[PDB]
Amino acid sequence: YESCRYRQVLQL
Amino acid sequence: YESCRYRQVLQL
Amino acid sequence: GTLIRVTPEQPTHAVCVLGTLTQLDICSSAPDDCTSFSINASPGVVVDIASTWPLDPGVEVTLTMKAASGSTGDQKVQISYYGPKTPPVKALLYLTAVEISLCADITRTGKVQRTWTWGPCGQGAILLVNCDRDNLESSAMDCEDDEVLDSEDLQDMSLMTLSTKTPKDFFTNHTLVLHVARSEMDKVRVFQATKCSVVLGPKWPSHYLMVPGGKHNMDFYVEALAFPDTDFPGLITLTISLLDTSNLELPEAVVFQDSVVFRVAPWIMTPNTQPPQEVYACSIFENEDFLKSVTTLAMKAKCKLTICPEEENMDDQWMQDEMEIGYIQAPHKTLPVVFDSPRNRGLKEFPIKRVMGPDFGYVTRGPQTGGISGLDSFGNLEVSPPVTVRGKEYPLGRILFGDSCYPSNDSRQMHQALQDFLSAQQVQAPVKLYSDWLSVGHVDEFLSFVPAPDRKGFRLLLASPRSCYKLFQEQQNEGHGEALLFEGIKKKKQQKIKNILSNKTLREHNSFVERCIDWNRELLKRELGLAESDIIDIPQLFKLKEFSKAEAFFPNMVNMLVLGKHLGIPKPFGPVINGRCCLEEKVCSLLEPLGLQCTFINDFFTYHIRHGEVHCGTNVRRKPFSFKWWNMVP
Amino acid sequence: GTLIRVTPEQPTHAVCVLGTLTQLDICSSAPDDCTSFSINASPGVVVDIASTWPLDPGVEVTLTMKAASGSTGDQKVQISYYGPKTPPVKALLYLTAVEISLCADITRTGKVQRTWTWGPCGQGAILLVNCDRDNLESSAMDCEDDEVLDSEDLQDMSLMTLSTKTPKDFFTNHTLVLHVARSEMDKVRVFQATKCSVVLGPKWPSHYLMVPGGKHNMDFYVEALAFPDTDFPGLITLTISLLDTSNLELPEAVVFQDSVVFRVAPWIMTPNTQPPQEVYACSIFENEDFLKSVTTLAMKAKCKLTICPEEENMDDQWMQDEMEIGYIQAPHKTLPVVFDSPRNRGLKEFPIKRVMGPDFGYVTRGPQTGGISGLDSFGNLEVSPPVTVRGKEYPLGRILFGDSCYPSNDSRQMHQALQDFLSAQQVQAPVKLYSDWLSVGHVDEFLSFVPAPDRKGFRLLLASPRSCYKLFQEQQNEGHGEALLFEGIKKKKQQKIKNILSNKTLREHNSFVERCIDWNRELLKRELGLAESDIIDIPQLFKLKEFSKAEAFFPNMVNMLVLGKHLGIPKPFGPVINGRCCLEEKVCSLLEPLGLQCTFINDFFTYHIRHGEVHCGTNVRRKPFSFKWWNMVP
Ligand SMILES: [Ca+2]
Ligand SMILES: [Ca+2]
Ligand SMILES: [Ca+2]
Ligand SMILES: [Ca+2]
Ligand SMILES: [Ca+2]
Ligand SMILES: [Ca+2]
Ligand SMILES: [Ca+2]
Ligand SMILES: [Ca+2]
Ligand SMILES: [Ca+2]
Ligand SMILES: [Ca+2]
């Protein structure tokens, strides 16, 4: 969940 | 909402 | 409230809405050298200082109007500021009062703050999900489109009155707006009655209203679109806002805002203790005797009957597992609603064509294109009668559905969408039970409720193998061990008492089944405030098969049809003594002194072969509760 | 409970778990001709009848064990059934007692029913979302993987103790299971400490435990994965279940089930009245004076400082609008958490690289790839100090964010995901305000909180144009109308007092802005229990532009930086009299007697030109509340 938000932000 | 459930069921 | 400060430089024009406290700030523009003030007002208004008073910021002045204004600026209030130097300074304020009142059925009575509170002392109106079809030439739920096609549909709505009392030329410099928050704009629709056109819906968040001056009343009709769920708690807010549009160059300014709060009526089930009104059944093949027995039972019970012919039946006879009938009610109308299971066997057309109609809603949840399990059959869907647990009351009972003890790799569970929907319907907080051990996995196969004159009013009946074993021990030790079970049935082998009593694998399997039943009994006793006097054991025998799941050894007599004080119990074909079966005699002597009549129907070759009983093949509609759901506090 | 019935035919073996009431059903298998019974038990157990007693179903027998069993079947209870005919019949029951206790920090103390209840008298433990990175060689939030990479990470978890006290050979015929419901299995992870391997997580719903006989203790570490939201209320249940596996052919049977309930710690903000601990800022160009002023203010306020160089800044200087710092706390650890806005301007790398680290969590919500509006900037995100409204207490304040008055076609709103997240964080129930009229639309541009020694402890400051107009009226009528506003700034035109006082369009625009401010003041006074003594007006002037939106005529002095008792206020460059600006003198005389020091910083050419102020370009970290959130009842 919040980990997925972390990965998505870091990609951008 | 519930109307969409109605249409989906009738199609099947 | 309303805060209007006065300036001696020029007079001030302000609008004071009747029903709102208006305080005067009298220090923002007060003369620096001033020390005291006095107030004189017209008799039409009331001024309260909460003769000469100091201008300290602590003191406050409240203004209250009594009657609506007939013309603009018809009241005047003057303030005389007194200073040690220079003559006193006079400030003026002109008042026009209007009356804007948006009202609904907040008292839950039937006749036409700003928050919905449960309980008998609460306030707040109720919407009804327009899930029926009052049009006889339409093929859609009447809330899908954006029109009202028949005046009878108007009876399934909620009324809202906008009362306006303003001067004649008031609305030349003011505007009224109706709106709903963007997160709820897609779960409500509001028509204006003059015949009626849409005002608010899933495409118009807000609408400007055209109202004339003087006295006027407007009628609005409100209908909901979605039942409460996890994403939608159930509260819908409708807001009326008054905007000032005096200057064209400048944008509008909001000056008054009233609102009303509605609750969407939840889906409420009916337990087995309510009087019946209508019975559904099926006809497939070799069903003349079964249907005749159901018909005579219904005639004795004084109810209706609906039968599905084999053309629309598609060789599906389990009406119970597909549809469940509940009701939704509001102070002005109570209408039933059919809940369609995600299971889509041959009976997927009956609940959608032959059930829903005039004053019969239809709602369903879950994935329809596969992805379910047997636990989704309405077998795991029952309701207990009103109960009191440890000082807390449930006048509408508790939902009961079964699932696995702990999550694993071969465990099953009711679909999460259905579980969350049932939980979101608060009025019957659900209770989970351990019924995964059954091959089909239906809580209807081991528990049943019966109406009782005395004590709490109900009596839960549970399947227990010990009862059958003690009966068989008595039958053997009185010397009739020669009795043959399954004598009436010719195809199935008859079994003698000694063999079944001396069987060891069957005893072990029934011990396991008894352990599961004991765990479920303790769970129910904890969750429904029962003693040992409210639970009756009806003998039964279970046997294990592939993957160690329980099946009824002889017809399940717990899954019976209850119609008021009449019972249709599946015939066990148990061993007979002196021309009467011991099982039937025992159950009749156990249920009759409660004030009932027992009739046994035979469905061995037509239902039991396909792992079913009478109650699993028929459905009953029941009268809604007399207790109003909104009166309960969750 | 536990229900064990006795049968005289053969002795019965049963397990009685210590801490559970066990009732004996003594009529299920009682002799038919029997009339009375007697009980004699070993001293190790206690039997309560709630000498000879009738066997009526009403009477009940309770059994209680005092000490754990050292061997299987070490207690015996005998029941003598007395009948008028035949000798009395003896029934036997053998008892072995175990002790299975799953314990956590239920008392919210820090040392190691079955329901989570708020309030100081409640019970129930708290998890912490492992949103930090305690590994210095990792580039992922430490809850993403399925391993514990450093012992320091163990400090961000929650402890759980499984105490087992059973005979030596007990677990040869019994099994223990740990599990979590399938709807919460993807929001929790549980490790077993011996160094530690996973036990429960988003791929293992349940795990069988290997425990030896005798005395033993097991340590489990629990970490949450998701913050509470609309789809996840916040309750996580962990269940320990004891299963009987005596017979291999038969499946397992559940015999005892204990559970514990955890709450996921919510995201809690910090208002402006808390002492600072760390200040963030930016450096882009011509920023030596601004940065120097911020540094000396921080040095005076005794705090840290963090500065982003222009290489990672990417010409973005609005730190306030991108990130907001709050805290999450539990009885054993309190750690801050950074909230990243969906806005992704040039500062999208600072909160993700230079902020989150050892003991600094990171959480964000919403759509990142566009689809937002200016209202999503953290400008509409403030918190009021602890407040008491109409008898209800909020010791952690109320969230304040602004949006449009009513939904329309050109109206804007905060993103629904952010609004639902803030609402799901209950401890600060949000309050909406009307701040769409501003061109940028930031509630930080018109309200501000300041710590006060007296009264409630705080003082809300609001922007009001009248204050500025009365100051200008005084400056004109004392004869200094020649004063020129914007004298210090050379590029911008200086404006004389008479022209600005006699301007009519500006007066109309400021009247509209005053009406909006008045509506917001009434809303805040209703929602925060304020009187007129807790609100201070700071003069300001607004002007309307394209699409009729308000902008600050001169630097906004409400958007100031508050550090304990020190203030950094944007310099208005207002007209000067006798070598001191009237605006600064008025504001200093209005704020100083409250016990503060005022320092004015100039950011006209570096911030105001791009529509910003000091507080919009800097961020502050603040000490968490001393009041424990779990002690509040929502
Ligand atoms: Ca319609
Ligand atoms: Ca209708
Ligand atoms: Ca269906
Ligand atoms: Ca109707
Ligand atoms: Ca049912
Ligand atoms: Ca980890
Ligand atoms: Ca950590
Ligand atoms: Ca970001
Ligand atoms: Ca840490
Ligand atoms: Ca902020």
Side-chain angles (χ1 to χ4, degrees), chain C residues 540-584:
Chain C
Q540 196 85 61
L541 276 191
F542 288 68
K543 49 94 168 173
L544 303 181
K545 213 57 184 58
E546 306 179 0
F547 295 12
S548 291
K549 306 304 182 177
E551 281 169 17
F553 186 66
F554 51 66
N556 180 241
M557 321 182 20
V558 175
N559 208 19
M560 30 182 208
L561 183 72
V562 64
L563 294 180
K565 320 166 153 315
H566 301 296
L567 293 193
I569 308 174
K571 203 166 181 293
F573 287 117
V576 312
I577 167 154
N578 304 346
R580 183 142 167 71
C581 155
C582 53
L583 260 171
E584 318 198 352

Side-chain angles (χ1 to χ4, degrees), chain C residues 320 324 378-379 381-382 615:
Chain C
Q320 173 59 94
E324 187 89 40
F378 280 173
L381 192 59
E382 297 281 319
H615 172 238

Side-chain angles (χ1 to χ4, degrees), chain C residues 253-519:
Chain C
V254 47
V255 80
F256 166 81
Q257 170 147 344
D258 197 2
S259 64
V260 80
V261 185
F262 295 117
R263 178 167 282 286
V264 178
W267 187 70
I268 318 175
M269 291 205 48
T270 66
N272 299 64
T273 58
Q274 298 276 107
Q277 273 180 354
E278 171 173 356
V279 184
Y280 301 92
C282 163
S283 174
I284 186 186
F285 209 106
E286 322 73 347
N287 289 157
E288 293 177 350
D289 39 59
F290 182 92
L291 177 63
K292 171 161 304 316
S293 302
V294 175
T295 53
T296 182
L297 183 68
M299 190 217 98
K300 157 183 319 198
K302 190 59 66 72
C303 52
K304 291 183 179 182
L305 261 183
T306 292
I307 42 183
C308 215
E310 94 280 4
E311 299 78 349
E312 195 97 0
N313 190 248
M314 309 266 299
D315 302 0
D316 184 1
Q317 70 285 0
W318 290 308
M319 217 142 272
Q320 173 59 94
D321 307 358
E322 174 89 11
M323 49 209 98
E324 187 89 40
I325 311 285
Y327 70 96
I328 53 178
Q329 91 170 307
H332 61 78
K333 201 171 192 121
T334 189
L335 62 153
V337 158
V338 55
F339 205 68
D340 185 7
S341 156
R343 149 201 151 113
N344 291 9
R345 305 271 201 64
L347 272 159
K348 43 173 171 78
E349 293 177 350
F350 186 71
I352 62 100
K353 177 57 91 152
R354 207 53 73 220
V355 158
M356 174 182 110
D359 270 42
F360 222 135
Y362 164 97
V363 78
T364 167
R365 285 306 224 285
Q368 318 264 348
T369 170
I372 63 200
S373 34
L375 259 52
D376 279 303
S377 302
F378 280 173
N380 284 355
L381 192 59
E382 297 281 319
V383 186
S384 62
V387 280
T388 299
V389 294
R390 311 171 309 223
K392 191 168 177 54
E393 273 202 351
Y394 302 87
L396 300 136
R398 309 199 71 176
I399 304 303
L400 305 182
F401 61 86
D403 87 2
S404 64
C405 167
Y406 70 91
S408 66
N409 90 6
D410 280 25
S411 83
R412 299 165 294 173
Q413 75 159 352
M414 189 157 277
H415 200 273
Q416 205 63 225
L418 303 186
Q419 261 185 33
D420 306 303
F421 177 69
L422 294 183
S423 272
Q425 316 299 293
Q426 323 181 51
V427 291
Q428 307 167 305
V431 167
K432 283 156 38 62
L433 300 179
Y434 174 44
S435 64
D436 162 68
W437 48 285
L438 289 162
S439 180
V440 46
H442 285 182
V443 175
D444 81 52
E445 298 214 326
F446 60 66
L447 77 75
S448 288
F449 291 89
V450 296
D454 54 302
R455 294 183 181 277
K456 299 296 183 181
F458 65 88
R459 294 183 181 277
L460 168 65
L461 282 84
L462 295 183
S464 300
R466 41 173 173 120
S467 12
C468 211
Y469 272 117
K470 97 158 60 173
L471 177 63
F472 284 173
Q473 276 310 114
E474 301 298 271
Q475 292 315 299
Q476 190 186 63
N477 70 358
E478 270 56 63
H480 324 73
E482 305 283 306
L484 294 96
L485 210 161
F486 296 133
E487 33 185 304
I489 296 319
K490 299 182 182 180
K491 302 187 194 175
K492 199 171 197 172
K493 303 180 181 181
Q494 331 183 92
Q495 298 173 62
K496 299 170 50 50
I497 287 290
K498 324 152 191 63
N499 322 116
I500 180 176
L501 279 183
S502 266
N503 196 343
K504 168 167 320 304
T505 50
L506 185 74
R507 174 151 261 111
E508 295 302 320
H509 297 182
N510 276 270
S511 173
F512 169 53
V513 154
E514 168 253 20
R515 196 137 70 203
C516 299
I517 284 280
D518 248 15
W519 176 257

Side-chain angles (χ1 to χ4, degrees), chain D residues 368-426:
Chain D
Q368 318 264 348
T369 170
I372 63 200
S373 34
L375 260 52
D376 279 303
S377 302
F378 280 173
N380 284 355
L381 192 59
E382 297 281 319
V383 186
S384 62
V387 280
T388 299
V389 294
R390 311 171 309 223
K392 191 168 177 54
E393 273 202 351
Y394 302 87
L396 300 136
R398 309 199 71 176
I399 303 303
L400 305 183
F401 61 86
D403 87 2
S404 64
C405 167
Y406 70 91
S408 66
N409 90 6
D410 280 25
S411 83
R412 299 165 294 173
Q413 75 159 352
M414 189 157 277
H415 200 273
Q416 205 64 225
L418 303 186
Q419 261 185 33
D420 306 303
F421 177 70
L422 294 183
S423 272
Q425 316 299 293
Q426 323 181 51

Side-chain angles (χ1 to χ4, degrees), chain D residues 97-116:
Chain D
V98 317
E99 168 171 310
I100 294 265
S101 309
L102 190 138
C103 164
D105 201 10
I106 45 184
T107 60
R108 302 125 176 217
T109 286
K111 307 179 181 183
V112 313
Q113 291 280 61
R114 324 161 171 141
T115 319
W116 212 93

